[PDB]
Design an enzyme around this catalytic site. Structure first.
Site, PDB file in Angstrom:
ATOM      1  CG  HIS A  64       6.172   5.037 -12.182  1.00 44.45           C
ATOM      2  ND1 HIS A  64       5.310   4.299 -11.713  1.00 44.45           N
ATOM      3  CD2 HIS A  64       7.276   5.174 -11.467  1.00 44.45           C
ATOM      4  CE1 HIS A  64       5.808   3.782 -10.599  1.00 44.45           C
ATOM      5  NE2 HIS A  64       6.948   4.325 -10.630  1.00 44.45           N
ATOM      6  CD  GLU A  67       3.247   4.378 -14.869  1.00 51.89           C
ATOM      7  OE1 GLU A  67       2.521   5.021 -14.171  1.00 51.89           O
ATOM      8  OE2 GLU A  67       3.948   3.522 -14.336  1.00 51.89           O
ATOM      9  NE  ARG A 122       8.863   1.276 -11.917  1.00 48.56           N
ATOM     10  CZ  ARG A 122       7.437   1.107 -11.776  1.00 48.56           C
ATOM     11  NH1 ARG A 122       6.444   1.324 -12.770  1.00 48.56           N
ATOM     12  NH2 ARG A 122       6.983   0.886 -10.585  1.00 48.56           N
ATOM     13  CG  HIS A 192       1.048   5.418 -11.038  1.00 51.65           C
ATOM     14  ND1 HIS A 192       2.082   5.097 -10.816  1.00 51.65           N
ATOM     15  CD2 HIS A 192       0.641   5.897  -9.995  1.00 51.65           C
ATOM     16  CE1 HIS A 192       2.712   5.605 -10.016  1.00 51.65           C
ATOM     17  NE2 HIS A 192       1.830   5.977  -9.179  1.00 51.65           N
ATOM     18  CD  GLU A 266      -0.934   1.222 -12.546  1.00 51.76           C
ATOM     19  OE1 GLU A 266      -1.118   2.116 -13.425  1.00 51.76           O
ATOM     20  OE2 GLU A 266      -0.380   0.216 -12.560  1.00 51.76           O
TER      21      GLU A 266
END
Ligand SMILES: Nc1ncc(C[C@H](C[SeH])C(=O)O)cc1Cl
Ligand SMILES: C[As](C)(=O)[O-]
Ligand SMILES: [Zn+2]
Ligand SMILES: [Zn+2]
Ligand SMILES: [Zn+2]
Ligand SMILES: [Zn+2]
Ligand SMILES: [Zn+2]
Ligand SMILES: [Zn+2]
Length: 304
Positions: A64, A67, A122, A192, A266
């Site tokens: 992404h 990120e 993104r 991520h 994440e």
């Protein structure tokens, strides 16, 4: 100028992949696994000392575009490998016994776009039939309950699943690589941001992997290890119930190929800065995240 403590643009990351390889030939080799929509080489670093029949861990960053802490992390992981190989017993054992494939930026075209045009992009930068809206969500583009929940059929939406599973060049290249290396790849890690979570399958349906108990315990221990450094609090569990149901993710897909240890990380933060995590947090975020990744790695190594 490349720095591990700043966000680096694609030209700098690409040059770094050549130079880090060039400078560490006994530990790093570099291949291109395909090319992006716009024709950029998707580089892959194989980190580890040569040896026979070595199992492998696959880690990617930069699915992404926005990120940025993800792309920085893969770079940090390589930094650690090369700096601490020989001095720190664990990382030395890992690199001697396993290979790590590190894919520092999957969605290069998007990443370039976040630097030149729109920091909050993104998706990929591929075209869609019948609209001027650009791009597909690469983490909705895998053949894993493809396009069924938590993914949009609209090409103008941020979770657009694309025209078909693996329609994107970048996702096809990744899946082809994994399929081609399936008998050696024992774990898949995909990095991520943001929201501080260690997620495992499944996200594409409310169902649980056969080794749920093992993944749950590993994720719990990895989160505990991560917290030891700065107290950073992660949650963990199966994607659908821990973050949201979402179909077409690479971790679910990888798991369905038989890769029993498949996690999405994440990273920081929980929303204060979100995707725009300041550079001042790169070091602390990568360092604590190293603890979790090394924990998972050690587990994988000890349970072959
Ligand atoms: N299978 C998956 N595993 C993890 C995630 C979460 C990420 C966080 Se940015 C995303 O929405 O792609 C999403 C899916 Cl589809
Ligand atoms: C908080 As999010 C949009 O990076 O899953
Ligand atoms: Zn020790
Ligand atoms: Zn993401
Ligand atoms: Zn995220
Ligand atoms: Zn998942
Ligand atoms: Zn360190
Ligand atoms: Zn054990």
């Amino acid at each position: 100028g490349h720095s591990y403590e700043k966000y680096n643009n694609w030209e700098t990351i690409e040059a770094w992949t050549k130079q880090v390889t060039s400078e560490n030939p006994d530990l790093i080799s570099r291949t291109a696994i395909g090319t992006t929509f716009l024709g950029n080489n998707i580089y892959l670093l194989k980190v580890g000392k040569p040896g026979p029949n070595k199992p492998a861990i696959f880690m990617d960053c930069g699915f992404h575009a926005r990120e940025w802490i993800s792309h920085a992390f893969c770079q940090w992981f390589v930094r650690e490998a090369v700096l601490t190989y020989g001095y720190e017993s664990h990382m030395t054992e890992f690199l001697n016994k396993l290979d790590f494939y590190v894919l520092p930026v999957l969605n290069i075209d998007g990443y370039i776009y976040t630097w030149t045009k729109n920091r909050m992009w993104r998706k990929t930068r591929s075209t869609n039939a019948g609209t001027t809206c650009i791009g597909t969500d690469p983490n909705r583009n895998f053949d894993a309950g493809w396009c069924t929940t938590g993914a949009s059929t609209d090409p103008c939406d941020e979770t657009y699943c694309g025209s078909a599973a693996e329609s994107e060049k970048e996702t096809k290249a990744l899946a082809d690589f994994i399929r081609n290396n399936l008998s050696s790849i024992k774990a898949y890690l995909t990095i991520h941001s943001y929201s501080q979570m260690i997620l495992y399958p499944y996200s594409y349906d409310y169902k649980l992997p056969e080794n749920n108990a093992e993944l749950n315990n590993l994720a719990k221990a990895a989160v505990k290890e991560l917290a030891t450094l700065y107290g950073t609090k992660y949650t963990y569990g199966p994607g659908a119930t821990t973050i949201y149901p979402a179909a077409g993710g690479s971790d679910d897909w990888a798991y369905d190929q038989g890769i029993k240890y498949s996690f999405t990380f994440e990273l920081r933060d929980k929303g204060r800065y979100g995707f725009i995590l300041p550079e001042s947090q790169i070091q602390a975020t990568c360092e604590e995240t190293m603890l979790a990744i090394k924990y998972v790695t050690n587990y994988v190594l000890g349970h072959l």
